[PDB]
């Protein structure tokens, strides 16, 4: 059955969603899970939203990712309208019409990080490491928790992901490369790929490593 | 309240 979560809404507007979910007996939860089917996002008129964690995780889990307007229009027409008419089209970072949410729904058989091992390394802010890890895992990557734990082999593609400005004023995220054999990329590599549901090239996200 | 990622 349907199971909704909401993102980017004023607890006012959350009020309307709660009233609507109560009216229709639709599961509404405050935390997104494997079972969530709909992530209801605040959008402008063209169904373009901001990127919140729930946004990424809705895309990563191939969920319906849908504008708040699906709820308000549905109330207005007293009928469960069609998600397709309200699917989020893009976000204010990666493009107003990149259609990630659709691609992710359509690509569960060819997940963008299939074949990758990813280590989410060093401090992060605003997104618990294990949610970043869940996000890559959803997208098909196998999750590695310590550098010394990358599986070796030429069939393995390791990647280290870091958020440089969560680090202490010391530039130690350039010395990760002497500790393992992988490319080292910013967290925006993940976030952009996930949003676009397309694996981006590392190139513009690589962090140079001291030898 | 929910963090945004720009």
Curated annotation (Swiss-Prot), chain A:
Effect of residue 22 to E: Impairs formation of a heterotetramer with ABRAXAS1
Outcome, altering residue 23 to E: Impairs formation of a heterotetramer with ABRAXAS1
Domain BRCT residue range list: 1-88, 108-207
Function in brief: E3 ubiquitin-protein ligase that specifically mediates the formation of 'Lys-6'-linked polyubiquitin chains and plays a central role in DNA repair by facilitating cellular responses to DNA damage. It is unclear whether it also mediates the formation of other types of polyubiquitin chains. The BRCA1-BARD1 heterodimer coordinates a diverse range of cellular pathways such as DNA damage repair, ubiquitination and transcriptional regulation to maintain genomic stability. Regulates centrosomal microtubule nucleation.
Full protein name: Breast cancer type 1 susceptibility protein
Entry PTM: Phosphorylated in response to IR, UV, and various stimuli that cause checkpoint activation, probably by ATM or ATR. Phosphorylation by AURKA regulates centrosomal microtubule nucleation. Autoubiquitinated, undergoes 'Lys-6'-linked polyubiquitination. 'Lys-6'-linked polyubiquitination does not promote degradation.
Effect of residue 189 to R: In BC; pathogenic; functionally impaired in vitro
Domain notes: The BRCT domains recognize and bind phosphorylated pSXXF motif on proteins. The interaction with the phosphorylated pSXXF motif of ABRAXAS1, recruits BRCA1 at DNA damage sites.
Effect of residue 37 to I: In BROVCA1; pathogenic
Gene: BRCA1
Effect upon mutating residue 3 to F: In BC; uncertain significance
Reported effect, residue 42 to Q: In some patients with sporadic breast cancer; uncertain significance
Effect upon mutating residue 88 to A: In BC and FANCS; pathogenic; decreased localization to DNA damage sites and reduced interaction with UIMC1/RAP80
Recorded consequence of changing residue 54 to M: Abolishes interaction with BRIP1
Effect of residue 14 to S: Does not abolish ABRAXAS1 binding, but abolishes formation of a heterotetramer with ABRAXAS1
Record note on what altering residue 98 to Q does: In BC; uncertain significance
Quaternary data: Heterodimer with BARD1. Part of the BRCA1-associated genome surveillance complex (BASC), which contains BRCA1, MSH2, MSH6, MLH1, ATM, BLM, PMS2 and the MRE11-RAD50-NBN protein (MRN) complex. This association could be a dynamic process changing throughout the cell cycle and within subnuclear domains. Component of the BRCA1-A complex, at least composed of BRCA1, BARD1, UIMC1/RAP80, ABRAXAS1, BRCC3/BRCC36, BABAM2 and BABAM1/NBA1. Interacts (via the BRCT domains) with ABRAXAS1 (phosphorylated form); this is important for recruitment to sites of DNA damage.
Phenotype for residue 3 to P: In BC; uncertain significance
Subcellular location(s) of the protein: Nucleus; Chromosome; Cytoplasm
Tissue-specificity statement: Isoform 1 and isoform 3 are widely expressed. Isoform 3 is reduced or absent in several breast and ovarian cancer cell lines.
First and last residues shown, out of full length: 1649 to 1859 of 1863
From Swiss-Prot, chain B:
Expression (tissue specificity): Ubiquitously expressed.
Signal peptide extent: none
Post-translational modifications reported in the UniProt record: Ubiquitinated by NEDD4, NEDD4L and ITCH; mono- and polyubiquitinated forms are detected.
Compartment(s): Nucleus; Cytoplasm
Highest rank taxon of the organism: Eukaryota
Function: Component of a multiprotein complex required for the assembly of the RNA endonuclease module of the integrator complex. Associates with INTS9 and INTS11 in the cytoplasm and blocks the active site of INTS11 to inhibit the endonuclease activity of INTS11 before formation of the full integrator complex. Following dissociation of WDR73 of the complex, BRAT1 facilitates the nuclear import of the INTS9-INTS11 heterodimer. In the nucleus, INTS4 is integrated to the INTS9-INTS11 heterodimer and BRAT1 is released from the mature RNA endonuclease module by inositol hexakisphosphate (InsP6).
Disease involvement: Rigidity and multifocal seizure syndrome, lethal neonatal: A lethal, neonatal, neurologic disorder characterized by episodic jerking that is apparent in utero, lack of psychomotor development, axial and limb rigidity, frequent multifocal seizures, and dysautonomia. At birth, affected individuals have small heads, overlapping cranial sutures, small or absent fontanels, and depressed frontal bones. Infants show poorly responsive focal jerks of the tongue, face and arms in a nearly continuous sequence throughout life. Neurodevelopmental disorder with cerebellar atrophy and with or without seizures: An autosomal recessive disorder characterized by psychomotor developmental delay manifesting in infancy, cerebellar atrophy, decreased myelination, and seizures in most patients. Additional features include intellectual disability, ataxia or dyspraxia, hypertonia, hyperreflexia, poor or absent speech, microcephaly, subtle dysmorphisms, and visual impairment in some patients.
Assembly description: Part of the multiprotein complex composed of BRAT1, WDR73, as well as integrator complex subunits INTS9 and INTS11. Interacts with BRCA1 and ATM. Interacts with MTOR and RPTOR. Interacts with NDFIP1. Interacts with SMC1A and PRKDC.
The family this protein is said to belong to: Belongs to the BRAT1 family.
Protein name: Integrator complex assembly factor BRAT1
Annotated organism of origin: Homo sapiens (Human)
Taxonomic placement: Eukaryota, Metazoa, Chordata, Craniata, Vertebrata
Gene: BRAT1
